[PDB]
Design an enzyme around this catalytic site. Structure first.
Site, mmCIF file in Angstrom:
data_model
loop_
_atom_site.group_PDB
_atom_site.id
_atom_site.type_symbol
_atom_site.label_atom_id
_atom_site.label_comp_id
_atom_site.label_asym_id
_atom_site.label_seq_id
_atom_site.Cartn_x
_atom_site.Cartn_y
_atom_site.Cartn_z
ATOM 1 N N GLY A 118 0.787 -1.262 0.000
ATOM 2 C CA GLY A 118 0.000 0.000 0.000
ATOM 3 C C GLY A 118 0.812 1.302 0.000
ATOM 4 O O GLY A 118 0.323 2.381 0.382
ATOM 5 N N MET A 167 -1.785 5.408 4.766
ATOM 6 C CA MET A 167 -0.938 4.697 5.715
ATOM 7 C C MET A 167 0.466 4.270 5.132
ATOM 8 O O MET A 167 1.516 4.357 5.856
ATOM 9 C CB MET A 167 -1.671 3.477 6.310
ATOM 10 C CG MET A 167 -2.308 3.569 7.734
ATOM 11 S SD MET A 167 -1.861 4.958 8.773
ATOM 12 C CE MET A 167 -0.295 4.243 9.421
ATOM 13 N N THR A 190 -4.044 -2.074 3.973
ATOM 14 C CA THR A 190 -4.767 -1.935 2.708
ATOM 15 C C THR A 190 -6.277 -2.230 2.750
ATOM 16 O O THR A 190 -7.089 -1.382 3.142
ATOM 17 C CB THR A 190 -4.139 -2.782 1.591
ATOM 18 O OG1 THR A 190 -4.205 -4.183 1.907
ATOM 19 C CG2 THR A 190 -2.725 -2.404 1.410
ATOM 20 N N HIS A 215 -13.109 13.619 16.999
ATOM 21 C CA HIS A 215 -12.552 13.308 15.690
ATOM 22 C C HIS A 215 -12.932 14.266 14.618
ATOM 23 O O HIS A 215 -13.974 15.046 14.701
ATOM 24 C CB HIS A 215 -12.851 11.916 15.209
ATOM 25 C CG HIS A 215 -12.137 10.854 15.973
ATOM 26 N ND1 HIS A 215 -12.606 10.375 17.184
ATOM 27 C CD2 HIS A 215 -11.013 10.150 15.704
ATOM 28 C CE1 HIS A 215 -11.790 9.440 17.639
ATOM 29 N NE2 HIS A 215 -10.838 9.258 16.739
ATOM 30 N N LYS A 253 -15.481 11.315 10.214
ATOM 31 C CA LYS A 253 -15.661 10.044 10.867
ATOM 32 C C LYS A 253 -17.161 9.810 10.771
ATOM 33 O O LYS A 253 -17.922 10.748 10.968
ATOM 34 C CB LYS A 253 -15.202 10.175 12.310
ATOM 35 C CG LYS A 253 -15.132 8.855 13.025
ATOM 36 C CD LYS A 253 -13.707 8.387 13.095
ATOM 37 C CE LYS A 253 -13.609 7.072 13.818
ATOM 38 N NZ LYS A 253 -12.280 6.413 13.400
HETATM 39 C C1 LIG Z 1 -4.445 -0.569 12.955
HETATM 40 C C2 LIG Z 1 -4.306 0.955 12.901
HETATM 41 O O1 LIG Z 1 -4.106 1.603 13.945
HETATM 42 C C3 LIG Z 1 -4.553 1.663 11.699
HETATM 43 C C4 LIG Z 1 -4.333 2.982 11.471
HETATM 44 C C5 LIG Z 1 -4.637 3.693 10.308
HETATM 45 C C6 LIG Z 1 -5.264 2.979 9.265
HETATM 46 N N1 LIG Z 1 -5.435 1.636 9.451
HETATM 47 C C7 LIG Z 1 -5.915 0.721 8.384
HETATM 48 O O2 LIG Z 1 -4.903 0.463 7.384
HETATM 49 C C8 LIG Z 1 -5.490 0.602 6.050
HETATM 50 C C9 LIG Z 1 -4.964 1.821 5.290
HETATM 51 O O3 LIG Z 1 -5.942 2.902 5.257
HETATM 52 P P1 LIG Z 1 -5.349 4.103 4.430
HETATM 53 O O4 LIG Z 1 -3.887 4.055 4.441
HETATM 54 O O5 LIG Z 1 -6.011 5.348 4.813
HETATM 55 O O6 LIG Z 1 -6.113 4.221 3.172
HETATM 56 P P2 LIG Z 1 -5.771 4.450 1.715
HETATM 57 O O7 LIG Z 1 -5.180 5.701 1.196
HETATM 58 O O8 LIG Z 1 -6.961 4.137 0.923
HETATM 59 O O9 LIG Z 1 -4.708 3.321 1.285
HETATM 60 C C10 LIG Z 1 -5.178 2.058 0.919
HETATM 61 C C11 LIG Z 1 -3.992 1.283 0.410
HETATM 62 O O10 LIG Z 1 -4.267 -0.113 0.097
HETATM 63 C C12 LIG Z 1 -3.933 -0.383 -1.265
HETATM 64 N N2 LIG Z 1 -4.952 -1.267 -1.754
HETATM 65 C C13 LIG Z 1 -6.306 -0.972 -1.805
HETATM 66 N N3 LIG Z 1 -7.023 -2.032 -2.119
HETATM 67 C C14 LIG Z 1 -6.089 -3.041 -2.380
HETATM 68 C C15 LIG Z 1 -6.222 -4.371 -2.813
HETATM 69 N N4 LIG Z 1 -7.398 -5.004 -3.047
HETATM 70 N N5 LIG Z 1 -5.059 -5.065 -2.984
HETATM 71 C C16 LIG Z 1 -3.883 -4.507 -2.665
HETATM 72 N N6 LIG Z 1 -3.642 -3.264 -2.264
HETATM 73 C C17 LIG Z 1 -4.798 -2.585 -2.155
HETATM 74 C C18 LIG Z 1 -4.184 0.948 -1.932
HETATM 75 O O11 LIG Z 1 -3.670 0.846 -3.253
HETATM 76 C C19 LIG Z 1 -3.442 1.818 -0.900
HETATM 77 O O12 LIG Z 1 -2.035 1.518 -0.851
HETATM 78 C C20 LIG Z 1 -7.001 0.709 6.272
HETATM 79 O O13 LIG Z 1 -7.812 -0.516 6.258
HETATM 80 C C21 LIG Z 1 -7.048 1.397 7.615
HETATM 81 O O14 LIG Z 1 -8.306 1.170 8.223
HETATM 82 C C22 LIG Z 1 -5.107 1.103 10.628
#
Ligand SMILES: CC(=O)c1ccc[n+]([C@@H]2O[C@H](COP(=O)([O-])OP(=O)(O)OC[C@H]3O[C@@H](n4cnc5c(N)ncnc54)[C@H](O)[C@@H]3O)[C@@H](O)[C@H]2O)c1
Ligand SMILES: CC(=O)c1ccc[n+]([C@@H]2O[C@H](COP(=O)([O-])OP(=O)(O)OC[C@H]3O[C@@H](n4cnc5c(N)ncnc54)[C@H](O)[C@@H]3O)[C@@H](O)[C@H]2O)c1
Ligand SMILES: CC(=O)c1ccc[n+]([C@@H]2O[C@H](COP(=O)([O-])OP(=O)(O)OC[C@H]3O[C@@H](n4cnc5c(N)ncnc54)[C@H](O)[C@@H]3O)[C@@H](O)[C@H]2O)c1
Ligand SMILES: CC(=O)c1ccc[n+]([C@@H]2O[C@H](COP(=O)([O-])OP(=O)(O)OC[C@H]3O[C@@H](n4cnc5c(N)ncnc54)[C@H](O)[C@@H]3O)[C@@H](O)[C@H]2O)c1
Lengths: 270, 270, 270, 270
Positions: free
Chosen positions: C9, C14, C77, C156, C160
């Site tokens: 990702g 993230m 992701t 938040h 949200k």
């Molecule tokens: C555990 C914790 O504290 C924490 C914190 C922040 C976010 N998250 C989670 O981590 C994830 C990232 O969210 P984000 O960074 O905002 O969002 P975002 O900008 O959408 O990034 C999503 C990432 O996943 C990649 N991706 C999307 N769908 C697929 C797929 N099917 N196959 C492979 N790669 C894919 C996408 O290309 C990008 O790199 C989410 O599910 C969040 O909920 C968790």
């Protein structure tokens, strides 16, 4: 679209936040993006330079080479750099928004003087939030200020070198003044060991220094039975970038004059 | 009903809050209510003395004159007064809850020594809230404490004479210790003028002094991207009065020993 | 240098913060940087991708094409994306740090099951700060929790969609549990119009929604005369990125097992 | 010495705090101290009645029996009680400070009407601190109010029956108005489950209910990058008692008119 702006310092921490505030802000167009001579450009200014690509705006080194594509100059660089830009602008009648701090007096006199030929918005803190808060503190000192205990707590990231914040001080004078006193007659900055009771009529200051805090300012007027508190929290430097960019659009239509944020925010009619 | 208590200092600011905490608290009965010799009594102790009338408990000056109507002695008076009570009690085996501060060393040795014949609960801060917070700070220093920036802000009413609070200090050692350091090697108390960046490994302290604030203590461990903060706010001196009164009932069944609030709160098993 | 990691990702919100947390963090080397198939790569992963250029690490689409240059997989992701990575890893014995939320049950059973062949660190909130705070709340509920009034305020950013925060809830159970109750028997989420007095034994929740606040959680246990409050403030998503990256280095040496942050932070020995 | 006052409700929670605010406040003399007929008097009003003894002022039941020893009437009792006092006063031209809340409309019309023969200061919240804060919120809504996210958090002791606070509402209208909107068109009071994003243009409210909190009100205007917050904290009901007592002295010299705290605090010239 409108008002074209030139963002000097495009690759500096402030200069970036400016390209963003400009692209995503209506009534303002990104005319140019400068930089120091002998630094890696990156054409598409706000493109690579500021997170979100594109912008056929290219980060030049000139000025005369851009004279005709920017109406206003936004400068958050260095006093030495600023004075130079100030000189080209004042010649060719470009207005400026000045966020460079640290000028020696001879420095500010330039700006003052230049402001008779061109329109300048020059200010110590470009956050709207801080500027309002300052007006509020005033009205407030005018009622409870007197007979209330007045303390100012400010917190900053771990790399601020001077304590208290220049905003906390600015907050202190806003208040000292309104009550018609002088901050230097009544400020207390340290509290160590056996202090004795809190002298009435004084303004105390407490300063926290930790992590990456961008900037927190609180003012309380404490009596017996109640406390008023006014706090401004800065979560990102973008806070200053919207203020500067809102000021350019404000200087639109203006010529000659030195203004600040109260001017722009109409806070003197408040 | 239970455990009878004698509240010395019945008409002093602490002594009042104690009569209330006692009447309205289960398992404890108000046996006596003392006072200085040559001060206006008012019989019905907690009656007139503490807001809510009644109590056929009368504020005497004796002690031998009350020996048989109180199991425990609660003392928030003066070191000179305390040492005397300590002597009658230790003779006739009455347990004590001691909240008088300010003993010279020779003073504390008395208490220590007396604690072999009777059960004593003696503590610097009798607020449960502050006592837990102190244990938390410890666990916490043990994880983030290290690599995080650690600051302590405390606020107090306008008549506190010494800065920082003795709780803030107590908070500082709790932490210095847990990280295995010494508070005196790493504490910074004032921040004025050009400070330079924040030295890593240090614990800073900011102290606010205003209105009638009873007592506020905050500890933050700041990193890049996040801050933990633990704050204890005291809205009334009753906070200490429930702590002391809960301790008496605790000393119920006990004989010999010097304990404190961790003892009483079982915080060492926490 | 050490442990090689693969940041899937890489161009997602993230994934970026992860490249930074990795480059500037000792004991961990950036082995790979993935991405969706049919998205603009940018070779030098953390280079362009994450603010600070360089890194001859190139953002591929494969996996088998990277098998030999990363020891651990960090996935933030999508559940659909995650399950796939989970399958390659479990085959070729790569350990994983999983921050993707939103799996259906059938989803979590995969992870659980896969964790017998490989070492997984999977957690709902990867901020160290939030994880400690949760342990503190517990110790604390165990003393004052009982007889104190317990409220949870969380704030938040304006986007949200669900209220209360999943952390606030997580905070609520930590507490309900410790007092041996069930959050669903004693939670109150709304307070409108004539409510009547506050039912004892309940845990209330207040939720603020504004600006860009990343995440604020406060827990107070209020009595008569005092309040304890524990607050965790998140200023940046980097907060989660250091947690995940610290976990990889933690999973170093491990094989089989499902762990979480308490595992990593040793909070069960706390 | 001056202005004589009659404190009705002398033994009620408010009536006490008034005797104190009066004795220890310059320019005001304690003329009388009333009470319900068929309640234990205690002569020396403020004497026993209000903590600090003395005052040859005796808590009567009359009114005609006191007509000549008080210039102003301070009433924090009951609408039924108030209307009666209002009638004696309006006959014999005594001015009044009215802090009794809960009148039916027919009730307020009395007051309005009576205010043509005598001078009345009647207000919903007599804390100076809350009254200023309200004016500040206004100026502020007038700048950032617009384009900022606006939330209001209030906390109260565990026995408040209605949520949100009547001050929080009062805060909400101050703001809705200034932006020229109607609070009822844009207020959101509950946030539960899947809410969806925060609708722009709305004013949210969060309400905490815990321990003995006397009264806390916070207003924030949140943007991207910064937050302004204005908080008023009440530590004691004395806060309202100084406000009322300051108003009497204010009504000194006045005859006919209905005023409130803005009148008294000159906040309309602010
Ligand atoms: C555990 C914790 O504290 C924490 C914190 C922040 C976010 N998250 C989670 O981590 C994830 C990232 O969210 P984000 O960074 O905002 O969002 P975002 O900008 O959408 O990034 C999503 C990432 O996943 C990649 N991706 C999307 N769908 C697929 C797929 N099917 N196959 C492979 N790669 C894919 C996408 O290309 C990008 O790199 C989410 O599910 C969040 O909920 C968790
Ligand atoms: C008014 C306000 O609220 C506010 C807020 C934030 C920063 N600032 C000021 O704005 C300026 C920017 O600070 P920054 O963005 O962190 O710092 P930084 O990353 O160092 O950026 C400095 C910028 O100025 C450019 N520059 C440096 N020296 C010269 C020179 N002699 N000629 C031309 N260009 C030059 C430099 O290349 C870069 O673009 C500073 O003086 C800050 O103090 C003001
Ligand atoms: C441990 C804790 O958390 C806590 C909290 C609050 C106060 N205190 C201490 O408890 C004590 C009470 O302070 P206070 O209630 O404000 O003050 P204050 O109103 O002065 O009361 C003092 C009391 O002691 C009585 N007294 C004074 N001197 C003597 C004497 N020589 N012999 C016998 N009785 C005497 C006095 O008559 C009165 O009852 C102080 O030492 C405080 O520092 C402790
Ligand atoms: C405006 C403001 O900021 C503010 C603040 C605090 C309380 N109040 C109001 O002031 C009043 C006092 O509340 P309180 O002090 O808690 O309550 P409380 O202890 O009940 O006192 C009520 C007082 O009114 C007296 N009283 C009751 N009924 C009558 C009657 N019919 N005739 C004459 N006297 C009567 C009663 O004897 C006592 O003195 C209430 O209506 C409060 O809502 C206002």
């Amino acid at each position: 679209a409108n008002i074209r702006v030139a963002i000097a310092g495009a690759g500096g921490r402030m200069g970036r936040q400016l390209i963003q505030a400009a692209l995503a802000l209506e009534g303002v167009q990104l005319g140019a993006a400068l930089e120091r001579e002998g630094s890696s450009l990156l054409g598409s200014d706000a493109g690579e330079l500021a997170g979100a690509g594109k912008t056929g705006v290219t980060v030049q080194s000139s000025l005369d080479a851009v004279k005709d594509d920017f109406d206003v100059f936004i400068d958050f660089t260095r006093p030495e750099g600023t004075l130079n830009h100030l000189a080209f602008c004042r010649q060719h009648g470009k207005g400026m928004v000045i966020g460079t701090t640290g000028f020696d007096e001879a420095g500010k006199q330039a700006i003052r003087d230049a402001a008779a030929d061109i329109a300048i918005v020059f200010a110590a803190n470009f956050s709207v939030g801080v500027n309002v808060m300052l007006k509020l503190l005033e009205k407030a000192a005018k009622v409870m200020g007197d007979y209330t205990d007045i303390e100012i707590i400010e917190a900053h990231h771990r790399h601020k070198v001077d304590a208290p914040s220049g905003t906390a001080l600015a907050m202190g004078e806003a208040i000292a003044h309104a009550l018609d006193k002088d901050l230097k007659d009544c400020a207390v900055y340290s509290r160590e060991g056996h202090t004795g009771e809190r002298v009435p009529g004084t303004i105390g200051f407490a300063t926290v220094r930790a992590g990456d805090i961008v900037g927190e300012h609180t003012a309380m007027f404490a009596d017996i039975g109640e406390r008023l508190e006014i706090t401004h929290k800065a979560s990102s430097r973008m806070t200053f970038a919207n203020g500067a960019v809102r000021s350019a659009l404000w200087l639109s239509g203006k010529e000659s004059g030195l203004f600040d944020m109260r001017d722009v925010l109409d806070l003197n009619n408040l």
